Amino acid sequence: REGVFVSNGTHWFVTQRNFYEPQIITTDNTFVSGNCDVVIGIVNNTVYDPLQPELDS
Amino acid sequence: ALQIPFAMQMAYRFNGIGVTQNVLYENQKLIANQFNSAIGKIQDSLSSTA
Numbered sequence: 121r122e123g124v125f126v127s128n129g130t131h132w133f134v135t136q137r138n139f140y141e142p143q144i145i146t147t148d149n150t151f152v153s154g155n156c157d158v159v160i161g162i163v164n165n166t167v168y169d170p171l172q173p174e175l176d177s
Numbered sequence: 178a179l180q181i182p183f184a185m186q187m188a189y190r191f192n193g194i195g196v197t198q199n200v201l202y203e204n205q206k207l208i209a210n211q212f213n214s215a216i217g218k219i220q221d222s223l224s225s226t227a
């Protein structure tokens with residue numbers, strides 16, 4: 121949403137671009153646009169939805 | 178100097194003009210061809226006249 125995706129080697133995070141502070145990737149750290157086919161160098165990784173545990177109550 | 182991939186540098190230059198970075202990645206081949214073509218016009222502009 122504003123930041124970079126980065127990986128430590130095993131896990132994927134999102135950071136602000138001027139200081140390394142790794143956050144878990146979520147539907148509110150991010151925004152969608154379209155299918156995966158269009159984008160060069162896209163990677164397969166899980167995005168966490170913060171509503172899913174709460175709506176599961 | 179901090180390295181960054183050129184298509185990711187261009188995404189952060191697109192966010193700088195208020196155009197959301199997916200508008201680059203979804204059009205990256207078009208934007209690359211328009212840039213390569215526009216540098217080609219500079220060679221003609223400087224070759225054909227002083």
Ligand SMILES: *[C@@H]1O[C@H](CO)[C@@H](O)[C@H](O)[C@H]1NC(C)=O
Nearest residue numbers: 127128129130131132133142
């Ligand atoms: C990457 O970060 C996660 C944070 O939970 C950690 O579990 C994992 O060991 C790290 N991997 C490496 C290669 O450092």
Ligand SMILES: *[C@@H]1O[C@H](CO)[C@@H](O)[C@H](O)[C@H]1NC(C)=O
Nearest residue numbers: 159160161162163182183184
């Ligand atoms: C990045 O470079 C490597 C080695 O040249 C290549 O295998 C890979 O396809 C390149 N990345 C993309 C997005 O094509």
Ligand SMILES: *[C@@H]1O[C@H](CO)[C@@H](O)[C@H](O)[C@H]1NC(C)=O
Nearest residue numbers: 156157161162163164165166
């Ligand atoms: C990404 O994941 C989907 C669903 O598991 C799969 O169809 C696709 O082939 C994967 N692509 C790569 C590059 O692993």
